[PDB]
From a paper:
The dedicator of cytokinesis (DOCK)/engulfment and cell motility (ELMO) complex serves as a guanine nucleotide exchange factor (GEF) for the GTPase Rac. The DOCK-A (DOCK1/2/5) and DOCK-B (DOCK3/4) subfamilies specifically activate Rac and have an Src homology domain at their N-terminus; the Src homology domain is involved in autoinhibition and binding to engulfment and cell motility (ELMO) scaffold proteins.
This analysis revealed several continuous movements within individual protomers of the DOCK5/ELMO1CTD/Rac1 core region. Next, to capture representative conformations of the DOCK5/ELMO1CTD/Rac1 core region, we divided the RhoG/DOCK5/ELMO1/Rac1 consensus map into 10 classes by 3D classification. The resulting structures of classes 1 to 5 differed from one another in dimeric molecular dimensions. Structural differences were due to the conformational changes between the armadillo repeat domain and DHR-2 in DOCK5, accompanied by a shift in the PH domain of ELMO1. Of the five, class 5 of DOCK5/ELMO1CTD/Rac1 showed a flatter dimer than that of the others, similar to the DOCK2/ELMO1/Rac1 dimer. Collectively, these results suggest that DOCK2/ELMO1 and DOCK5/ELMO1 are intrinsically similar in structure and exhibit conformational flexibility. Consistent with this theory, our cryo-EM single particle analysis reveals that the DOCK5/ELMO1CTD/Rac1 core region is highly flexible and can, therefore, readily transition to a flatter conformation.
Residue numbers in the entry:
A (entry chain D): 530 to 727
B (entry chain E): 629 to 1262
C (entry chain E): 1 to 248
Amino acid sequence: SRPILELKEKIQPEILELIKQQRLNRLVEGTCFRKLNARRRQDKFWYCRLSPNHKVLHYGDLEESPQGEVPHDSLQDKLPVADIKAVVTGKDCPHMKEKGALKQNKEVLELAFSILYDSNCQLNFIAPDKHEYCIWTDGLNALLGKDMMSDLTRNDLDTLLSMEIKLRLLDLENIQIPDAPPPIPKEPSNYDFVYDCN
Amino acid sequence: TKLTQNVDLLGLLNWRSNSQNIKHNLKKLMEVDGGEIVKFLQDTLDALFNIMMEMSDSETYDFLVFDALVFIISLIGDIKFQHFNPVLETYIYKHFSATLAYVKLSKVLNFYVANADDSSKTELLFAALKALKYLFRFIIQSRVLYLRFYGQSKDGDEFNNSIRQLFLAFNMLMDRPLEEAVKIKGAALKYLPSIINDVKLVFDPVELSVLFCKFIQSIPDNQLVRQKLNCMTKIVESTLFRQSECREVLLPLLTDQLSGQLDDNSNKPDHEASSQLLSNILEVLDRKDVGATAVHIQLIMERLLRRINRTVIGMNRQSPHIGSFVACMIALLQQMDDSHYSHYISTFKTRQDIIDFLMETFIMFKDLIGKNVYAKDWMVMNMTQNRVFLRAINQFAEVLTRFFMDQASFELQLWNNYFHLAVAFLTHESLQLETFSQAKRNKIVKKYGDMRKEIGFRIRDMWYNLGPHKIKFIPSMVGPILEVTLTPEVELRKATIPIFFDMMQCEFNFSGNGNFHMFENELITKLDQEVEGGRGDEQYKVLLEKLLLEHCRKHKYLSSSGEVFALLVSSLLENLLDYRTIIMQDESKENRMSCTVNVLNFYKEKKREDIYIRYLYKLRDLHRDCENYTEAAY
Amino acid sequence: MARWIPTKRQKYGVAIYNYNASQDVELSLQIGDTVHILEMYEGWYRGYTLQNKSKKGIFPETYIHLKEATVEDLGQHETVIPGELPLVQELTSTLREWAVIWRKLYVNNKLTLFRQLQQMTYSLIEWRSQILSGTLPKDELAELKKKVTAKIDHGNRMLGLDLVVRDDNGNILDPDETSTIALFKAHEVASKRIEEKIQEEKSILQNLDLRGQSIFSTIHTYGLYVNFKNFVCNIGEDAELFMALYDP
């Protein structure tokens, strides 16, 4: 399968592309995110929609919406990407370094992500579980145009690559691909087509 | 499977040495276990047959052999013994040895029929009725065995007569009231065609057919309707592979029952049964080998179509098997030729009755295309229905052109039903519908082409044939024709904008007194609603404008007026184009109000007061979405 | 690159690998590009590709594993066994549309149906592989014809797609506009199988006894396979062990 694997893993471009596209769609659709330590009647649900323009983030101190996102220009409708330095994830989050009343507990370490914008104010966020957290940071890295850091993302990429190479190889069944590609037959150096083109 | 535990079986097999016991053995055969019976079914049959030959004169023994054999075949018909039923027919064709069992058994059963009201022969005749097929396989085989054993049947008259007086026993038994023997009549109807193919070996098909016809006209015509439906159905099942000699003698009587079923208000048992009739008869008549019937197909048309069409006036309800009846007569359409249609479809009674007929058929068609009678999964059946309805309406198109067109001095207004029916049918299965799968376009075009294309060109040649009465018809059809032009198809639309020029030219002739203002007004209206809907596209309006503009160049100054009006149309269009694209692009508020005030202004330009108001209403709807009591008030 | 000829003995254009870009109309050509070649050259072939049935591509014959087979494998008897290989082409086009189905099935988080789709997909590709040849008995051929039609129209039912009838022999004969009423009741058969499946997914994929009852309504003789492993009993003598079925 060595030539087959060469052929397969050489034509990547579109697979990670589509996975990142899906991540982007996930951020655009968005859902109710969690604030910090939503305890004293604080909204553990509030939405953050990536723009239809993909230029603003519809994040705002919205209420406990079990449905999910409510569509409007949120309490903080703007989050341009031109200034998004990064997102601190895990212990790197300032909300994970808080030792005051907002001290995030030990059950939010993987729910730790705060978008770096303005270099001082971080969208100190908490996730409902690991997978959507990884997807959020994935899509944000897609806004940064970098790699996807969900384990399930690499799952999707490998399985799509395997299925795709599976769904191409049909015709060369009963035939082999030499590791060195079979010799290109010497074309007639004259471009002369005795019968017309097409 | 070979060992036997019963004195009775050994005695009956050994009946020849047990001759004093034959009468007693013929009744003790009943208590023999069937499992033991089919161990020596062959020998038991040979025993009984050689009995009722060796003392056929003693009709007591023939009767008891009859009774015992009938009881055995009834027992073998069991699922346990349905595997030895092939063994039983093996005996029939091979191991049978009775040279007069045909005479003897046809005789005994003629007695059973002529004496059916007897309640001791009632069960005997019944049990003979259930297996009539088996019993006269045996008997027709005994007849031919006699033929072989004697070269020629000197009983050649005798047995075929025994059959004929059995016909007459049928007729006299069932001429009696239904109460005594309703179940006997039912079994006769059921298993009588089970034996007609048996007797096809040794009887004339036509004489047999008419003997049954006599039996069936010995019917008092209000007894066991679906049952005789079954009877004829099993009849045409067999015995019709030889079609041209009984088809023409039974279809008389059978269209008799059909026209009785036309509307007797008692079809409620016979609805599905008659549809089944139609089914099997359309099969067999359409069965290529069963027999040529094209002229008899036309006979069927002339004697069954006004019939069944008034009957579907009756069965015009969607909930029942209306769809199955639809399948019936459209199968008829399929199996049939315009040589048959225009023969008398185009040549019915007085023009008023035929136009009433076409009113019926056309409203029915328009009511089937609406609230379609499929599950939407029947694109196959959809296409079938399309083709057959196409066939029917084509025939009605020729009758329209040759009997109600300029041909007729008046009543050019079935054409309303014609055109609108055709369009409403035409308004499904479009290019996006073709676009479901990638092969879907290909699948349809290969297997069906584009039905829409024929539909449209058919209607177009009809339109060109209308000639003057376009004016007398334009406002009625302004709406539908714009839609058919909307169809994503390039070619029908390309042919259809010139039809727009056609009727605006006609109203240009009418513009001597008036103008196409009603035409263009309705056109504009429907244009508004339709482009709101969102079928057409940009290249589409391009085609529209190119065509109509060009055609009006081919015409005069008022066609230049119609040109600038089509220009207004195109402006309108592209306004709706970019309008809707924003409507389904931004989904903000402000851009929506932007485009809507623009188009509103455009109505203001065109003074399309009503629709102008309408989009004013949409716009104020936007403003009290925005609570623009200010703007909403304005 | 001379000598090009319009011919139809080449339909199965076959690649070798992610093809060279040897011509302007050629790429790292897809492995399953059965290319309808409009022009016949000895060492090369250019015509309507599988991805693009509207564009040529000059493909080397050293890479063209040309097959004379057309769509139907019985015209030149390309069938490994008559009356079957229409199955292989329909299954190929089937998976063609399966491509769109699943590529959408990830867009919508419907992963249960999508995964049962995958496992049916693996089952069908392996059945497809075994029936690349005619090795299985024609009993298995018709059985797998039935099952492939079943799963195909099962996907259609799940997705509101077309209905293919003529249950056996390529699902064409009835959809070959032979009649109306036979076709009518055949599409009635189609809806009957529609209801059978759409009611039986929850009966077989979910329930376990109704499926056995439905099977046993078709079969009457049975054999209870009893596999004696080892006997534990303190007898001290020769033991006769009479094993039979009992009805208390």
